[PDB]
Assembly symmetry: none
Homo-oligomer: 137 residues x 2
C-alpha cells in the first residue's frame, strides 16, 4: 500500500526521483521551461549534471517526507504551506502540481510494480487542495 | 523532449524511418512521383524492396543530425543549404517538406511513445523557413 510505496521509492530514491521527473517532463514537455538548465539536454546528459540528480532527489525526498507525515493520504497543512512559500515555487500554480501527479500516477501504473496508484492519485488531489488553501493561485 | 526524441529515434532508426516515410507517402500518395519504383506497392512490398529501407534510413540519419545540430529546434543554415543544394532535391519546393512534417507530427501524436510532437512541429517550420532563406522555392 501507500506506506510500502514510500519504502520502495526511498529504497532507490535517486532512480525513482529521476525516472518520475523525466516522465513528468515527457508527458508535459512545456513544463521544462521552469528548469532552464535542462533545455536541449538528452536524458543521459541530464544525469551527468550534478544539480539534476541532486535537486531531483531533494524534491522527491521532501515528497516522501510529506507523504509519510500524511494521515490516510491527507497531507499536513504545514507541509503544503512549505511548498507554497518556497522561493523556487513562486511562479507555480496548482496546475503544475496536478500535472506532476498525473504523470506520477501514470508512471506507477505502467511500472513492473506493485504501487498503490489509487492512493498516490488521492494524495495528489489532497495536496492540491491544501496548496490552494495555503494561497497557491 | 526534443533532444531525447532524437536519441529515441536513433535507437530504432530503421523502423521509425520506414514507419514515418510510409505515413508520409500514405497521407500524400501524390508525393510518390518524386521517387522511382514506389508506385503500385503496398507498405510490406516497399519494405522488402532492395533500396527502400536503405534510402529511408539515409534520409533519417541526416534528419536526426540536422535536429541534433539545432539549438532550440532552429537548424543550422549550412544544414539547410545542404538540403537545398543536394542534386536529389533539385525538383523540390518547401511544400514537400511541409507535408513530410505534417505526417511526421501526426505519426508522433498517434504513437505509443511519448514524443514531444509540438517541438517537432516547430522544428519542421524552422527548417522550412531555413530552406526558404537558403533559396528553395
Ligand atoms: C510535491 C511536489 C514538490 C515537492 C515536494 C518539491 C520540492 C522541491 C525541493 C525540495 C526543491 C529544492 C531542491 C534543490 O536542491 C525544489 C525546487 C524546485 N522546484 Fe519543486 N517540488 C514539488 C513540485 C514542483 C513542481 C510541480 C514544479 C514545476 C512544475 C517544481 C519546480 C521547482 C523548481 C523550478 C525548483 C528550483 C530549481 C531547481 O531546483 O531545479 N516543483 N522543489
Ligand atoms: C529534412 C528532410 C530531408 C532530409 C534530411 C533528406 C535527406 C536525403 C538524403 C540523405 C538522401 C540520400 C539517400 C541516399 O543516398 O541513399 C535523399 C535523397 C532523396 N530525397 Fe530527401 N531529405 C529530406 C526531405 C525530402 C522530401 C520532403 C522529399 C520529397 C517529398 C525528398 C526527396 C528525395 C528524393 C527523391 C531522393 C533521392 C531518391 C531516393 O532516395 O529515393 N527528400 N534525401
Amino acid at each position: 500500500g501507500f506506506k510500502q510505496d514510500i519504502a520502495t521509492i526511498r529504497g532507490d530514491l535517486r532512480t525513482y526521483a529521476q525516472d518520475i521527473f523525466l516522465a513528468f517532463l515527457n508527458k508535459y514537455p512545456d513544463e521544462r521551461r521552469y528548469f532552464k538548465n535542462y533545455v536541449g539536454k538528452s536524458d543521459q546528459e541530464l544525469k551527468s549534471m550534478a544539480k539534476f540528480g541532486d535537486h531531483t532527489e531533494k524534491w522527491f525526498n521532501l515528497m516522501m517526507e510529506v507523504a509519510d507525515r500524511a494521515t490516510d493520504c491527507v497531507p499536513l497543512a504545514s507541509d503544503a504551506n512549505t511548498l507554497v512559500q518556497m522561493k523556487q515555487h513562486s511562479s507555480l500554480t496548482t496546475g503544475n502540481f496536478e500535472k506532476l501527479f498525473v504523470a506520477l500516477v501514470e508512471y506507477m501504473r505502467a511500472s513492473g510494480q506493485s504501487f498503490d496508484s489509487q492512493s498516490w492519485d488521492r494524495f495528489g488531489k489532497n495536496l492540491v487542495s491544501a496548496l490552494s488553501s495555503a494561497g497557491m493561485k
